[PDB]
Design a protein around this nucleic acid. Sequence first.
DNA 1: AGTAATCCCCTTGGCGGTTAAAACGCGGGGGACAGCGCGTACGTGCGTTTAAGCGGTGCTAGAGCTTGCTACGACCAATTGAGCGGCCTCGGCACCGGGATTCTCCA
DNA 2: TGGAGAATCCCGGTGCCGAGGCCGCTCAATTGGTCGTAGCAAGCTCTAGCACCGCTTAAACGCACGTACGCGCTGTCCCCCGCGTTTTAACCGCCAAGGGGATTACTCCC
Lengths: 109, 80, 73, 59, 98, 74, 93
Amino acid sequence: RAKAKSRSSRAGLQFPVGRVHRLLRKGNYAERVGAGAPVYLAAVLEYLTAEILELAGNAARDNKKTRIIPRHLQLAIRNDEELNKLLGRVTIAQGGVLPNIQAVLLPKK
Amino acid sequence: RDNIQGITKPAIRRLARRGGVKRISGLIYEETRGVLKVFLENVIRDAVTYTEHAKRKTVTAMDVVYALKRQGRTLYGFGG
Amino acid sequence: VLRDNIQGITKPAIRRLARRGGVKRISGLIYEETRGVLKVFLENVIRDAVTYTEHAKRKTVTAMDVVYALKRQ
Amino acid sequence: TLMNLVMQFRKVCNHPDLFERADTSSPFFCGHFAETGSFLREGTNVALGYSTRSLVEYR
Amino acid sequence: KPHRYRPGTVALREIRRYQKSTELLIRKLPFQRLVREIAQDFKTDLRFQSSAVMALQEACEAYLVGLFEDTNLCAIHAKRVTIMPKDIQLARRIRGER
Amino acid sequence: LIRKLPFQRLVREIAQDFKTDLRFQSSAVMALQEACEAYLVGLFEDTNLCAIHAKRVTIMPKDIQLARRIRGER
Amino acid sequence: RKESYSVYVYKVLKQVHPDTGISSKAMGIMNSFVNDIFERIAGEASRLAHYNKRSTITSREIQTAVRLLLPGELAKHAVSEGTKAVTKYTSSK
DNA sequence: AGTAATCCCCTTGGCGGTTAAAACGCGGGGGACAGCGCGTACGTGCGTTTAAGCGGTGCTAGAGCTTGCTACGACCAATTGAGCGGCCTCGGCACCGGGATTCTCCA
DNA sequence: TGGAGAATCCCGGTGCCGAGGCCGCTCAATTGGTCGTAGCAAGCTCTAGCACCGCTTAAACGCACGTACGCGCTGTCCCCCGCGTTTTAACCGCCAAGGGGATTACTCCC
């Protein structure tokens, strides 16, 4: 009985290939679940989590904050064209909005 | 009861400021109340439908999130 | 090879599509705007219809692949 | 069904109002009236019309 | 004579305050009662978790803020600075709610 | 409403950006055309409201752009 | 006993920004996001298997799902990350 | 095995106050809206030509279906440590105050 | 251009509560072997997709030219904004209740 090394560690991922395998089964998405399909998915979940948190860590830094807040997630997600297209029907709790004033509303000379 | 009038004029003003609106016709306030309750009457009947079908006599945050997600307005932060 | 076939949706065709949408009068700048609309639409439908075709390892795009692409809009 | 009845007997041994409470009462009323269908939708202000009507109904 | 900012100056100072903020803009207790009222029409003797009425408020406010943006663009599409009921009515018809 | 042959050629021309030497079933092109006509007709309806709302009987490019912006297409 | 992505999100946060924290409410957004995109991908992978008349969710199902659900450059980067993760799971066990 | 008392917990309801947010009044400004003149830009009709549409002929790519098996996932039992619930603390972020800088408006 | 003063910013100080790490343990992920089968592969069938020709005429284009309508301009007036006053109800805290769901007792019935 050999020493166990997690499917995540073998794949090289921080995200859990085990849970992604279970949840692909418990959700009854299909009758059979391949061995590598939880790995591919666990990698994409990890990748997109890095995209969000990279841009949000920049935005937190811009606000002189050490710590990410749903505000910084909203700012990151709306500023980036592709995250904004990926999340174009998602409401983020306590995100607020982008600062955006139509040019016609600004004061006259 | 009419707590729809508890959605005050200053509150409808504040929401329009966040929406970036400079000048607001006084007729807007009753239009906005009519629009708000039509939204709530769709989300709560679904949130009730979940608690009813899931056989509980209290409404949980996730009942709302399923209701919203099925309405098409995915909310992140309250489960989901 | 094919090029500029977006000018195959003629201005009378854009008139017919606008009149059936109830439009009375049409600014002469609409005709190029309509093409920038139709092409951006038809690209991202066909992008999926072809993705459903190279998945399942086939070479004709089928009406079902179109239907699955539209259903993704 | 004694698993029910021993308690139901014991209830009246203690006091009959536990079994079915005595209340303000009147003769059988042999007439039509409009009964309330919903308590919830009646609200706080309501008009009590005189609905009392005979079931013997000569046409 | 008192100092007085011109009409529309503080409307801009306010836009730059409610944008650039995260707070909920509807008072909490009034929204609870409106929610309970609407709930009674569907099932009486329901109850709500605190996080359920919060989730429901957050979704409402985000719906109204996002709606106002679309009416601001309708108002500004006509020559106007002022939003009117006909702008809400246009926005919701273009969206397909109406 | 759109002529069939120049719509076929538009479909082929677009598709070649994704995969060379695709084939299209005849029913697949008609399903694309019928969706495009229904899409353009349905957008012109929404632009006509944008013109009429601005008191203009004549639709203008900013009416397309307002319709799409509110539909969330942009 | 509930289950959360918080530990894995922290282990991504400390890679991209080893100095940076995250608040519980923001971690909430990350859980909802991972749940929502996991479910969106699995939903297309399900439909792709069903359309093909196949009983099996393979990595090929999840590849085609990722190329449907993501914008063009996120799609390609995700397809790259996914294809190497499976390649290193292969050549192991 | 059933039905009722006992007890936890968590939601709803009421009371008091305090103060911060909603309502109310009033001057004026400036933005909404009707009105006018022009002019240019879109709808109309005609003659032109262009190619979309139809009926018809020819080929081969490849969609679709069957056969055969073995590689890959479903299922189970034993092993263990990765991940969750509970407790702790200290440092990040807010909140305040005060003086410094900015912006706005009438002169 | 200046100025006055209000509104927005910044700098340092205070404190509180929640973020980040530690601890115990369970139970869910992993190791090992089994067995069924499905979908990967090789092979045949013939559908239907693509290519070309020739004809027809309806559909598309270029142009003349009139007038209907988009747009900048002018005037007004009304109604929505900025600010001081008045008042009410949202917020907070603390106590009550009730209800319901899980547990435990005791009898009758099988």
